[PDB]
Design a binder for these strands. Structure first.
Ligand SMILES: O=c1ccn([C@@H]2O[C@H](COP(=O)(O)NP(=O)(O)OP(=O)(O)O)[C@@H](O)[C@H]2O)c(=O)[nH]1
Ligand SMILES: [Mg+2]
Ligand SMILES: [Mg+2]
Ligand SMILES: [Mg+2]
Length: 1826
RNA sequence: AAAGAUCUGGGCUGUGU
RNA sequence: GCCCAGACC
RNA sequence: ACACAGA
RNA sequence: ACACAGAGACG
C-alpha cells in the first residue's frame, strides 16, 4: 500500500472533516504464513522472516525476507510497528511543525502521520491495533483514537487560514479493519496479514523472555494466577470418575490425541458414501434411464399423490370414520348488535314465561331474569354516582364497602335435574355427574379423532366468501365516538392532512364487521377475566351485561386454573346484522331470545380474545399494504384479502397447537419449490410430521389444503426469471388458499400460525409426551461402546461416530484457525481462558433464573407423595455461598464438582417450553451442575471465538459471510457466476450427541492442563437423573394397568409399577435416568465447535473435489460455509464458460450437495427434513431469507406481537413498551403508514386496558383527560405519521411538553423540585431528574411483597448496606475483594427496582386485564410525593390523581423555559432538528413509483451524542477518586477532562466525602446512578429498503408506502439544478440564472415562520426585478434571511502575508427570524470568538442558534472559548450547543446587495466589513429537484 | 410455570354500590 | 453492569 | 517526567 | 366446552 495515493484519494472540504467509519472484513483467500525465527539475545529481538509461500493473489507481497532487529525497549510496540511499516516508514511528527503554534499542552502531541499535499490540504492519520476478536474492540480503539486528537486539532484549525484537515484513523485487528480512509479491500487484507505476522512475532518474543511485555494490572495477574493454581492442583479423581460414569476412561482421550487418523479408512469411506449418495440421487430423482424433466416431474407428482394417499388412509383407519358432523370452528355466536349507550344494568321486564318453555337453557335464563326482576340479585343496577364518591374520596379505607363484592350480581337458580344433566354434559358441575351413562358416553366419544375425508367445505366457502370486511354502518356509535375522541385528542399534536387521512383510514378499518364483532368479544373476555376472582358457591351463577351492547352473559367460575363456563343471551330484535358463514356454533331459539349453550375458556385462552380487535385491525392494514392498496383509498375487498383476514380470524379464535403446527410446516413444504435441476422438489418429505390426531374441522381443512400444496409443489418447481440484473421467481402461491401471490406474501403466509397464543398452560395428560420425547433416544443407545469414541466404522448406528473422521474434522478446523490467528493461537487462547475463568465472580452467577431442587431425598415416591416440589432461584444458592465465605468461581467449582461426583449423577428437573413450531422439552440443573457447566462452556466459547465461520460466538458472521460471497466469487471467478446453496438443519440435535465426542472435540483445542477438568466435567452428562412431575406420577401410581394405543404409556406404567424392567426407570422412583445426549442448549458452544469442525471438513473436502473434477479438468469454484448450533449453510459458486460444461458442473455440485446427508452420520449428526438442498440464487439462515438481492423478512411475525398486555407497573412504562414493540414492526419491514396504523391499534389496546369497555366512569375519566393529557395519568401519545416508530417515547414526550399543556405541568414540577433542600421532605436531586422521571410518577403494583420479604429473610443481608457503602464508596466502582464488599454488592443487586419487581411478580396478565373494572375509581395507585405532593393517604385512584393535578399543577402559568427544557430533555436540540425535518411532509401528495426490488438492511442514525468528554464520567470519576486506570489517558489529558467535569458540576471534588456533602445527592449509590447516565443516548433504527439531514429525508420519502414517493417553480428548480451542477464557469452560469428568473413567473412572497426554498426563490426573483423597492424591506417582512450589521466594528489589521485580522470587541446587531439579536465577539490576533448572545425573546431559540452558527461559519468565529461571566442567564452556548445555565464552559445567552455563486451554492449577500463578506439568502439545489 | 444462549431496543377479589 | 421486552437457536 | 504502545 | 392416539381438569 502507498500513503501518498491513499491520502490523495480523499476529498477534503473546508474545516475539519472526520468522515464516516467503514468496516472491512477478512474476505480474500490468504496464503500460508511465512516461516518465523525469533531470537532474543538481549541486544534487541532478531526475527528471521522467510519468504511468503507460493500463491497467486498478490497478497502478502509487501513482506520481505531477511533479518530484522527490533530493540527490547521498542519490542512492546511490535504489533503497531510491523503492521504499518510500508504505509508509514517514519515514526512520528509533532503538531508544532505543520500547524500554527498554539500554547496549550498539546503542542508536543505526535500523531503517526501528518501528510501535506501540494495545494495545502493536511491529512492527520493515526494508526492502531487491537487483539480483540469482536467489532466492539475495533470500535473502542477507533473511538479512543478519535477522542485523543479531535479537540487539539480543532483548536489549531481555528487559527489557520484556508484550512483543509481530515484526521483519518486506521484500526487493524485479526479479522477486521475499521477506518474512515478510502482503503481498498486489498490494502485492508494486507494490513490484516501483516498484523498476523506481527502478533506471531510478538507472542514468540514474549514466550522466550517475559520482559518484552509491559507490567499488567494486579487484578489481571491475580485472575491468571488463581486460574493457573486451580487447573494445576485440580484432581477430579479420574479413577472414581471411571468407576462412576459410563465410558469415562481417559485412555480414550489419550488414544484420540496420539493416534493419527486412518487415512485409508477415510478415503475408502468417502468413496463408498459418494457412490451411495449418487445411487440415492439417481434412484429418488429418476435421473436414470435418462428421461426428460416433464416425465420426471410427472413421476414426482405420482409419488407425492401416492404417499399423501397413504397418509390419509392411515389417519382414517384410526379415526371415528364419520364424514359429517356439526361442530363449529368458532364457539361464539355471529351476532352484530348495533352498539347502544353506556350501561351495565340488567333491567328486564315483562317476558319471562315464554322463555321458560324453551329447554334447559331457556329455563335457566328465565329463572335468572325472574330473580333479577324481584330484587334478589344485588348490584343489578349500577350507580355511577356513589362510585364517583368513592373515587373522589379524600378518606379511603372507611367509605369503601368490603363485603358487598361477595354477593355482587350472584343468583342461585333452582334448576331441575334434567337441566343440571344438560349443563353437566358441557362440563358445568360435570365432576359430580361423571358416573352417569350419558356423561360416560360423551367422555368416551370426546377422545375419538376425526377423519381426513370429513366434509369441510363451509370453511373454504367462508374463507373465500365472507362479510368480515363489509362496512357495518356503526361508525357513529358510542364505542366509535369514544375511540375517535381519544385519537383526535392525541392527534391534535400533529393536526395535519396526513394525520387526518391516516386517521380516516383507521376509523374505516374500525367500522368493518369483523372489528365490531371483535370489540364485544373482547369486552366479554374482559368480563370473564373479571369473573375469575368473583368466587361462587355451589349453584351460584353471575349475570352480567356488556357495557356497549345488549348482550347478557351467565358465568360459572371455578378454580382459577380450571375452566370458566359462560352462556350468552340476546334479544332477536337487538340483532341488527350477522356475520355470514357456517363456521359458527349453533344457537338456541327461545321465542323472543336467542341463547347460547355453555362454552368454556381457560385463563390462557382469554388473551387471544382480549387482543382480537387489535389483531384484526392490524391484519386488515397489513394485508391491504401487501396487496398494494393505499390506506387513503376506498376499495372493495378482493378474494385474497378476504382469504387472508378470514384465515387470521379462524386461527385466532380456534387457538390450538396442532392448527398452527400444520400452517408452520408449510414453510418447509414450500421451500422445495426453489430446488434446482438436476434435482426435483420433494415436499413429501414433510409427510412424517403431518401424522397425528386430527380433532377439529379446521385442522382437517388445513391438512387437506397442505397436501394439495405438496402435490402442487412436487409437480412444478418455482420458475427462475432473470431479466436485467436480478433473479425473480414465478409460480409462488399461498399454501393454504392456493391463490397466486408475491414471494413476500408467501413468506409472510408461512407465519399466520403465529397468531395462536404461545403462553398456553399444559395439562397433566399432555405431559407424558415430553417424557416420550426423551425415552426412545435413550432406548436407541448402542449395546456396545466400541463406536462411542474408540474405533472406526463406515456404517454407524444412532449415537455412534468414527474416531478418524472426528480427528480429521478437528485437524481441518485447526488448520483454518492457524491460518487466521497464526501458529501460536493456542498460547493466546490459554491466557484468554485463564483470564476469563479467574476474573469471573460468584455474584455474576446470581441470576434471576430457576434452579433444580431435585436431590436424593426426592427420589423415592413413597416418601414424597405428600410433598410439593418447587424450584428455587439461583440467586438464593449463590447468596448462601457468598454468606458462607466463597467469593470466586474457582473456590466454588471445586466443591461443586466434589458434590456432583459424590452424588454420582446430575440432578435435572423438566418443563415444557412455550413456543411455536412444536414440542420442546426444557432441562433445569441444580446449582452444582450449573457451576460445573459454566467453566466448560466458557472454554468452548473462547474456542468458538477463534473459528472463522462459527456464528454463535461471532455475531457479525451471521451476515458477513453470506453477503461477502458475491465479492469473493466475483474476484475468484470473474463475473457471470452461478451460485448454488444448501440450507441445512439437524434432526434432534441435542439428543443425538453422545458427550464423549464433545469432550474429545473440546480437548483437541484446549491446552493439556485443562484436559483433566474437561474430561471429568463433561463425564457427568453420562448419568442424568431427571425428575418427573409429582402430580403426573400420583395419577400414574393409582393406575397399575394400561389401556392405551401408545406403547410408551404402557411401558412407563409398567416401569413405575415394576411389571417390566427398562434401563430408564426403576420401580417407585420419581425420575427417568438417561445416559445419551446433551441437554437442550446446555453444551451449546461445544456443540457449535463440533459443528464448525464438521463443516470445515466439508469445505476442505468440497474444495479438493472441485479441484479434482469430473473427467480430469478442475471445476473453478468458491466454497463458503456458515454454522450455528445445528443450522448450517453451504454456498458454492461456479463459472462453467459454456453451455455443455454447465450441465456437468451443476450435476457435480448437486452430487457434492447431496452427500452431506450421508456423511453427517459419521460425526453423529443426522440431517433433518427441514433442510432445503441445491437451491440456485437463494439461501436461508436462522429464518433470514436471502432471495438473490432481495432480503425477505417476515413482517407479520412482529406485527402479531405489537400489542402485548404489559406486566409493567408504571403507567407510562406501558407506552414505552408499546413504542419498543412498534420499533420492531418498523424494522421488520413495515412502512411508516402501516406503523402508524399499528400504533392506532395500540392506542385502542391501551384504552381497553384502562377500562374503556368495563368501567362505567370511563366517560368522566376521558373528559378529565381531554383537559389534562398527561401520559403518567394514562394519556396515549401518537407519533408523527411520516416517521412513526422511528423516534421513541422520549421524543414524543418532549413534543407533548413543547405542544400541549404538559409543558406547564412539567414547569411546575421543576419549580417544586428545585425549591427544596437536602433535609427537606420529599427531596430529590434536580440533577438526576429528567422527563422520564416525571412521567414515571404514577405506579400500580401487581405482585405480592410477602414473597419478596420472605425471600429477603432467607438471605441474611445487612440492613445498613447503604451506610456501609457510604463508608467505602469504592465498592461501587470495581470488583469485590472480601466477603464484605461482595455482600454489599449482593444487597445492592437485590434492592434494585428491576430485581424486586422481577422476584415479586409472577404471571399477572389476568390481573392486569381484570384491573379495568377498578383502576379508575379504587385507590390502588402509588404516586411520587416529590412530584404530586403529600396526599391524605399513600394511595389514590386515577380520577383522584386527575383532580389533584387539576387543582394544583394546572393552575401554574407559563411553559418550560429553555433551561428547564435543556435539563429535562438533554437531547432537545437534536429532537428539534429532526422535528424541523419532519414538518416538510404535512400533506398526502406524491407519485406511485417502481419498488425496484433491491432490498437490504441499512441503519439510520439520529439524535447523535454530542462531543463533550473524551471518556465516560464513570471511568473518569473512578480514576480520579480511587486510582483505577479505567481510562486510557495520561495525567495531562486526565486533568483536562476532570476540568470539564468540574465545569459541568462545580460541586464535584476529588474527595468522595466532599462531593457527597456538597452535591445534591443524599447517598453515594444515588451519585453512582446519576454519573452512570451523564451521556444521554444515541438512537439508530435499522430499516430494510433501497441500498443507500439527508438520509432521514430519503427514508421518510421512500418508506411511507411501498411503491410510493411522498413529495412552474419546480421547473425553475429543475433548471437551476442542472445550471449549478453543469460544466460552465461563473460568467456563463451567471447569465442564464438571470435569464430564468427573467422568464419564469414566481408567486409573491409572504410571512412564513419556517424555512421554505420556494419563498427564498421568490426573494431572489424580486431582487433581480426590483419590483417592491428595497430588497432589505422585502426580506424583513418575509422573515427569511439574516439581516443586520456591526454596531461596533472591530479594529482591522494586516496579517503577515496577504491575510487580514481583527482584534477588537466587535458587536453585531440584527434580526434573524423575527428576533432582535445582539452578538458580542472578541479577538486576540489569531481567532475570534463569541462572548455573549442577547435576544429579545426565546420563542424560537433553536432556530436562532442555528442561524448564529451559519453566521459564524463564514465570518470565522468559533464558540470554543469559555466566558468568565458567572452571573445569571437562561442558557449557555458551547460549540453552538444549548447548555444548562449553571454550566461554566460556554458563552451566556441572555434576555434583552449582490448575488453570488459559490461551488454549487447560490447566494444573495452584502458586504459587512473590509475583507469580510456575510450572506443573507442561500438556496442549495438538491437531487430531488429534477 | 418460565433452562442454556445470541442479537436488537428500552429502563434504572385493591371488583366494579 | 443489572433488569425488562421481542425475535432467533 | 513529557511523548508513545493498548484483548 | 378445554386437554388427550382415552395418563388430566370439570373444585
Ligand atoms: O429454545 C430453544 C431452541 C433451541 N435450542 C438448542 O438449539 C438446538 C436446535 O434447535 P432446533 O430448533 O433445530 N430443534 P432440534 O432439537 O434440533 O430438533 P428438530 O425439531 O428436529 O429440529 C436444539 O437441539 C437445542 O440444543 C435450545 O436450547 N432452546
Ligand atoms: Mg499513533
Ligand atoms: Mg434441528
Ligand atoms: Mg435449527
Amino acid at each position: 500500500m502507498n500513503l501518498e495515493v491513499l491520502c490523495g484519494r480523499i476529498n477534503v472540504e473546508n474545516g475539519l472533516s472526520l468522515g464516516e467509519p467503514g468496516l472491512y472484513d477478512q474476505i480474500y483467500d490468504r496464503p500460508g504464513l511465512p516461516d518465523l525465527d525469533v531470537t532474543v539475545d538481549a541486544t534487541g529481538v532478531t526475527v528471521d522472516i522467510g519468504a511468503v509461500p507460493d500463491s497467486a493473489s498478490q497478497l502478502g507481497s509487501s513482506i520481505n525476507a531477511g533479518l530484522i532487529t527490533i530493540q527490547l525497549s521498542e519490542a512492546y510496540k511490535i504489533n503497531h510497528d510491523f503492521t504499518f511499516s510500508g504505509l508509514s516508514k517514519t515514526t512520528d511528527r509533532r503538531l508544532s511543525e505543520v500547524f500554527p503554534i498554539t500554547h496549550d499542552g498539546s503542542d508536543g502531541m505526535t500523531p503517526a502521520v501528518i501528510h501535506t499535499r501540494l495545494d495545502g490540504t493536511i491529512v492527520v492519520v493515526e494508526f492502531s491495533t487491537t487483539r480483540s476478536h469482536n467489532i466492539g474492540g475495533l470500535e473502542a480503539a477507533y473511538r479512543t483514537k478519535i477522542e485523543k486528537y479531535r479537540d487539539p486539532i480543532s483548536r489549531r484549525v481555528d487559527i489557520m487560514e484556508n484550512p483543509r484537515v481530515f484526521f483519518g484513523v486506521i484500526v487493524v485487528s485479526s479479522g477486521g479493519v475499521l477506518s474512515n480512509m478510502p482503503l481498498t479491500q486489498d490494502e485492508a487484507e494486507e494490513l490484516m496479514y501483516r498484523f498476523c505476522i506481527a502478533n506471531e512475532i510478538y507472542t514468540k518474543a514474549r514466550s522466550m523472555d517475559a520482559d518484552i511485555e509491559l507490567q499488567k494490572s494486579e487484578e489481571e495477574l491475580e485472575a491468571i494466577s488463581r486460574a493457573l493454581s486451580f487447573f494445576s492442583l485440580f484432581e477430579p479423581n479420574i479413577e472414581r470418575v471411571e468407576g462412576t460414569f459410563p465410558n469415562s476412561e481417559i485412555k480414550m482421550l489419550e488414544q484420540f490425541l496420539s493416534t493419527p487418523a486412518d487415512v485409508d479408512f477415510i478415503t475408502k469411506t468417502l468413496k463408498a458414501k459418494e457412490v451411495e449418495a449418487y445411487a440415492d440421487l439417481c434412484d429418488s430423482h429418476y435421473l436414470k434411464p435418462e428421461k426428460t424433466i416433464q416425465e420426471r416431474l410427472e413421476i414426482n407428482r405420482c409419488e407425492a399423490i401416492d404417499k399423501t394417499q397413504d397418509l390419509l388412509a392411515g389417519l382414517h383407519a384410526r379415526s371415528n370414520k364419520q364424514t359429517s358432523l356439526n361442530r363449529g370452528t368458532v364457539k361464539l355466536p355471529p351476532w352484530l348488535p348495533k352498539p347502544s349507550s353506556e350501561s351495565i344494568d340488567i333491567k328486564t321486564d315483562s317476558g319471562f314465561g315464554s322463555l321458560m318453555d324453551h329447554g334447559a337453557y331457556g329455563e335457566l335464563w328465565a329463572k335468572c331474569l325472574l330473580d333479577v326482576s324481584l330484587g334478589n340479585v344485588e348490584g343489578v343496577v349500577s350507580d355511577p354516582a356513589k362510585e364517583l364518591d368513592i373515587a373522589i374520596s379524600d378518606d379511603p379505607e372507611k367509605d369503601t364497602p368490603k363485603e358487598a363484592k361477595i354477593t355482587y350480581r350472584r343468583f342461585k337458580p333452582a334448576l331441575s335435574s334434567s337441566a343440571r344433566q344438560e349443563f353437566s354434559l358441557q362440563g358445568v358441575e360435570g365432576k359430580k355427574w361423571k358416573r352417569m351413562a350419558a356423561n360416560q358416553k360423551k367422555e368416551k366419544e370426546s377422545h375419538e379423532t376425526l377423519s381426513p375425508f370429513l366434509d369441510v367445505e363451509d370453511i373454504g366457502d367462508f374463507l373465500t366468501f365472507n362479510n368480515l370486511l363489509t362496512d357495518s354502518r356503526y361508525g357513529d356509535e358510542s364505542i366509535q365516538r369514544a375511540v375517535s375522541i381519544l385519537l383526535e385528542k392525541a392527534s391534535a399534536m400533529q393536526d395535519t392532512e396526513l394525520t387526518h387521512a391516516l386517521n380516516d383510514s383507521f376509523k374505516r378499518n374500525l367500522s368493518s364487521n369483523v372489528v365490531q364483532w371483535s370489540l364485544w368479544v373482547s369486552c366479554l373476555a374482559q368480563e370473564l377475566a373479571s369473573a375469575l376472582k368473583q368466587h361462587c358457591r355451589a349453584g351460584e351463577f353471575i349475570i352480567k351485561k356488556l357495557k356497549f351492547w345488549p348482550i347478557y352473559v351467565i358465568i360459572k367460575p371455578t378454580k382459577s386454573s380450571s375452566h370458566i363456563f359462560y352462556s350468552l343471551g340476546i334479544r332477536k330484535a337487538d340483532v341488527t346484522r350477522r356475520l355470514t358463514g357456517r363456521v359458527f356454533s349453533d344457537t338456541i331459539d327461545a321465542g323472543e331470545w336467542e341463547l347460547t349453550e355453555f362454552k368454556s375458556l381457560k385463563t390462557c385462552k382469554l388473551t387471544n380474545l382480549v387482543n382480537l380487535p387489535c389483531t384484526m385491525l392490524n391484519s386488515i392494514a397489513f394485508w391491504r399494504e401487501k396487496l398494494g392498496v393505499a390506506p387513503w383509498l376506498v376499495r372493495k375487498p378482493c378474494s385474497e384479502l378476504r382469504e387472508q383476514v378470514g384465515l387470521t380470524f379462524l386461527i385466532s379464535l380456534e387457538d390450538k397447537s396442532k392448527t398452527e403446527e400444520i400452517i408452520t410446516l408449510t414453510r418447509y413444504t414450500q421451500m422445495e419449490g426453489f430446488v434446482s435441476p438436476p434435482m426435483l422438489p420433494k415436499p413429501q418429505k414433510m409427510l412424517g410430521k403431518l401424522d397425528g390426531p386430527l380433532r377439529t374441522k379446521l385442522q382437517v381443512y388445513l391438512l387437506r389444503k397442505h397436501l394439495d400444496c405438496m402435490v402442487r409443489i412436487a409437480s412444478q418447481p418455482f420458475s427462475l426469471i432473470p431479466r436485467e440484473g436480478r433473479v425473480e421467481w414465478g409460480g409462488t402461491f399461498h399454501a393454504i388458499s392456493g391463490r397466486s401471490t408475491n414471494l413476500e406474501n408467501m413468506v409472510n403466509s408461512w407465519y399466520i400460525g403465529y397468531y395462536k397464543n404461545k403462553e398456553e398452560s399444559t395439562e397433566l395428560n399432555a405431559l407424558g409426551e415430553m417424557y416420550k420425547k426423551i425415552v426412545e433416544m435413550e432406548e436407541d443407545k448402542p449395546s456396545s461402546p466400541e463406536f462411542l469414541g474408540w474405533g472406526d466404522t463406515d456404517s454407524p448406528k444412532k449415537h455412534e461416530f468414527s474416531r478418524s473422521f472426528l480427528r480429521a474434522a478437528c485437524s481441518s478446523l485447526e488448520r483454518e484457525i492457524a491460518q487466521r490467528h497464526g501458529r501460536q493461537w493456542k498460547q493466546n487462547l490459554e491466557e484468554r481462558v485463564l483470564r476469563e475463568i479467574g476474573t469471573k465472580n460468584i455474584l455474576d452467577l446470581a441470576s434471576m433464573k430457576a434452579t433444580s431442587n431435585f436431590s436424593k431425598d426426592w427420589e423415592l415416591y413413597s416418601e414424597v407423595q405428600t410433598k410439593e416440589y418447587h424450584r428455587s432461584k439461583l440467586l438464593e444458592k449463590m447468596a448462601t455461598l457468598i454468606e458462607k465465605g466463597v467469593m470466586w468461581y474457582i473456590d466454588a467449582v471445586g466443591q461443586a464438582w466434589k458434590a456432583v461426583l459424590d452424588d454420582g449423577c446430575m440432578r435435572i428437573c423438566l418443563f415444557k417450553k412455550n413456543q411455536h413450531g412444536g414440542l420442546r422439552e426444557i432441562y433445569v440443573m441444580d446449582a452444582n451442575a450449573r457451576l460445573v457447566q459454566f467453566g466448560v462452556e466458557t472454554m468452548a466459547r473462547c474456542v468458538c471465538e477463534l473459528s472463522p465461520h462459527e456464528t454463535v460466538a461471532n455475531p457479525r458472521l451471521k451476515n458477513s459471510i453470506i453477503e461477502n460471497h458475491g465479492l469473493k466469487s466475483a474476484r475468484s471467478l470473474g463475473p457471470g457466476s452461478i451460485n448454488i446453496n444448501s440450507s441445512n438443519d439437524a434432526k434432534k440435535w441435542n439428543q443425538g450427541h453422545y458427550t464423549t465426542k464433545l469432550a474429545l472435540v473440546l480437548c483437541w483445542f484446549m491446552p493439556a492442563k485443562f484436559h483433566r477438568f474437561i474430561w471429568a466435567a463433561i463425564s457427568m452428562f453420562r448419568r442424568k437423573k431427571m425428575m418427573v412431575d409429582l402430580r403426573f406420577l400420583a395419577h400414574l401410581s393409582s393406575k397399575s394397568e394400561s389401556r392405551s394405543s401408545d406403547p410408551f404409556r404402557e411401558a412407563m406404567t409398567d416401569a413405575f409399577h415394576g411389571n417390566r424392567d427398562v434401563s430408564w426407570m426403576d420401580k417407585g422412583r420419581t425420575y427417568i435416568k438417561t445416559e445419551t445426549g446433551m441437554m437442550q442448549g446446555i453444551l451449546h458452544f461445544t456443540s457449535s465447535l463440533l459443528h464448525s469442525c464438521v463443516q470445515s471438513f466439508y469445505k476442505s473436502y468440497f474444495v479438493s473435489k472441485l479441484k479434482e473434477g469430473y473427467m480430469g479438468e478442475s471445476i473453478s469454484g468458491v466454497v463458503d460455509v456458515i454454522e450455528g448450533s445445528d443450522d448450517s449453510a453451504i454456498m458454492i459458486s461456479i463459472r462453467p464458460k459454456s453451455d455443455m460444461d454447465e450441465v456437468r458442473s451443476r450435476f457435480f455440485v448437486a452430487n457434492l450437495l447431496h452427500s452431506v446427508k450421508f456423511l453427517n452420520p459419521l460425526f453423529g449428526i443426522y440431517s433433518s427434513e427441514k433442510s432445503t438442498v441445491n437451491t440456485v440464487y437463494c439461501v436461508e439462515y436462522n429464518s433470514e431469507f436471502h432471495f438473490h438481492r432481495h432480503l425477505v423478512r417476515p413482517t407479520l411475525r412482529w406485527i402479531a406481537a405489537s400489542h402485548q398486555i404489559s406486566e409493567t407497573e408504571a403507567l407510562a412504562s406501558r407506552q414505552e413498551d408499546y413504542s419498543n414493540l412498534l420499533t420492531q414492526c418498523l424494522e421488520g419491514g413495515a412502512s411508516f403508514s402501516l406503523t402508524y396504523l399499528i400504533q392506532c391499534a395500540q392506542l385502542l389496546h391501551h384504552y381497553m386496558l384502562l377500562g374503556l369497555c368495563l368501567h362505567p366512569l370511563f366517560g368522566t375519566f376521558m373528559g378529565m383527560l381531554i383537559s389534562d393529557p398527561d401520559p403518567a395519568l394514562g394519556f396515549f401519545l401518537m407519533d408523527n405519521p411520516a416517521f412513526a416508530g422511528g423516534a421513541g417515547f422520549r421524543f414524543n414526550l418532549w413534543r407533548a411538553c413543547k405542544t400541549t399543556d404538559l409543558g406547564r405541568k412539567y414547569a411546575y414540577y421543576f419549580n417544586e423540585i428545585q425549591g427544596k433542600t437536602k433535609g427537606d421532605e420529599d427531596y430529590r436531586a434536580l440533577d438526576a431528574t429528567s422527563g422520564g422521571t416525571l412521567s414515571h410518577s404514577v405506579m400500580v403494583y401487581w405482585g405480592d411483597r410477602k414473597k419478596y420479604q420472605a425471600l429477603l429473610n432467607r438471605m441474611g443481608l445487612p440492613e445498613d448496606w447503604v451506610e456501609q457503602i457510604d463508608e467505602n464508596p469504592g465498592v461501587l466502582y470495581r470488583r469485590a475483594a472480601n466477603k464484605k464488599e461482595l455482600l454489599l454488592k449482593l444487597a445492592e443487586k437485590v434492592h434494585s427496582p428491576g430485581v424486586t419487581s422481577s422476584l415479586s411478580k409472577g404471571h399477572v396478565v389476568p390481573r392486569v386485564v381484570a384491573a379495568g373494572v377498578y383502576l379508575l375509581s379504587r385507590h390502588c395507585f402509588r404516586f411520587s410525593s416529590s412530584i404530586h405532593g403529600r396526599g391524605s393517604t399513600q394511595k389514590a385512584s386515577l380520577i383522584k390523581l386527575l383532580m389533584m393535578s387539576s387543582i394544583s399543577a394546572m393552575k401554574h402559568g407559563g411553559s418550560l423555559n429553555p433551561n428547564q427544557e435543556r435539563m429535562l430533555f438533554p437531547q432537545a436540540q437534536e429532537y428539534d432538528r429532526v422535528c424541523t425535518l419532519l414538518e416538510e411532509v404535512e400533506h398526502l401528495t406524491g407519485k406511485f413509483v417502481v419498488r425496484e426490488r433491491n432490498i437490504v438492511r441499512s441503519r439510520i442514525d439520529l439524535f447523535q451524542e454530542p462531543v463533550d468528554l473524551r471518556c465516560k464520567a464513570e471511568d473518569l470519576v473512578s480514576e480520579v477518586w480511587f486510582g483505577l486506570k479505567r481510562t486510557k489517558l495520561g495525567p495531562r489529558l486526565l486533568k483536562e477532562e476532570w476540568d470539564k467535569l468540574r465545569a459541568s458540576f462545580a460541586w464535584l471534588s476529588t474527595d468522595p466525602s466532599e462531593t457527597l456533602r456538597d452535591g445534591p445527592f443524599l447517598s453515594h449509590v444515588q451519585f453512582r446512578n446519576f454519573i452512570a447516565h451523564v451521556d444521554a443516548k444515541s438512537r439508530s433504527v435499522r430499516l430494510l429498503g433501497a441500498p443507500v439531514v439527508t438520509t432521514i429525508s430519503q427514508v421518510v420519502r421512500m418508506n411511507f408506502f411501498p411503491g410510493f414517493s411522498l413529495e412552474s417553480i419546480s421547473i425553475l428548480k429543475h433548471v437551476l439544478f442542472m445550471v449549478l451542477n453543469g460544466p460552465y464557469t461563473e460568467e456563463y452560469k451567471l447569465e442564464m440564472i438571470i435569464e430564468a428568473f427573467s422568464t419564469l413567473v414566481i408567486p409573491q412572497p409572504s410571512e412564513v415562520i419556517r424555512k421554505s426554498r420556494t419563498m427564498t426563490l421568490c426573494l431572489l426573483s424580486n431582487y433581480l426585478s426590483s419590483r417592491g423597492g428595497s430588497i432589505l424591506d422585502q426580506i424583513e417582512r418575509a422573515q427569511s434571511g439574516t439581516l443586520g450589521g456591526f454596531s461596533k466594528p472591530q479594529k482591522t489589521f494586516v496579517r503577515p502575508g496577504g491575510g487580514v485580522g481583527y482584534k477588537g470587541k466587535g458587536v453585531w446587531t440584527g434580526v434573524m427570524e423575527d428576533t432582535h439579536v445582539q452578538i458580542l465577539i472578541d479577538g486576540d490576533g489569531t481567532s475570534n470568538w463569541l462572548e455573549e448572545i442577547r435576544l429579545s425573546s426565546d420563542a424560537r431559540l433553536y432556530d436562532v442558534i442555528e442561524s448564529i452558527r451559519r453566521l459564524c461559519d463564514d465570518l470565522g468565529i468559533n464558540n470554543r472559548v469559555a466566558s468568565a461571566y458567572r452571573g445569571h442567564c437562561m442558557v449557555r452556548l458551547s460549540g453552538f450547543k444549548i447548555k444548562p445555565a449553571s454550566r461554566t464552559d460556554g458563552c451566556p445567552v441572555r434576555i434583552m446587495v449582490k448575488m453570488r455563486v459559490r461551488g454549487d451554492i447560490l447566494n444573495l449577500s452584502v458586504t459587512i466589513q473590509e475583507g469580510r463578506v456575510m450572506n443573507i439568502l442561500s438556496y442549495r439545489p438538491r437531487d430531488t429537484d429534477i
